[PDB]
Design a protein that fits this description.
The PDB classes it as biosynthetic protein. By secondary structure, this protein is mainly beta. Helix content is 0%, strand content 48%.
Length: 127
Amino acid sequence: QVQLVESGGGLVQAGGSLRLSCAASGRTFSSYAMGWFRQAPGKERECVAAMDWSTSATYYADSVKGRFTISRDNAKNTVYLQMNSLKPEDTAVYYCAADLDYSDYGPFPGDMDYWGKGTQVTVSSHH
């Protein structure tokens, strides 16, 4: 069975970093575009980042440009999201997703071929 499993999330202080990891298993993924979505309760799910397979094109939501970096490792069947300078507005469930069609990311996404179950990221501040 095909699975995308996110890890590396959880709690982090504002200004901190996390590196999400998506372990993709059960089929060949090197010809899939991979991406990250996020959704906070009461808000729509949005595409945060994506990367093509057939070219090195990447997409980032405006709110994360310069802060988040998507990359992948085909040998490890993993996709990463380096998330820096985190703010409370980054708090959400982050989902890994795979799609044959890179044009299905980003600001008006299509449906993905596979979805991870998601992992919680919580960015808190303290004053």
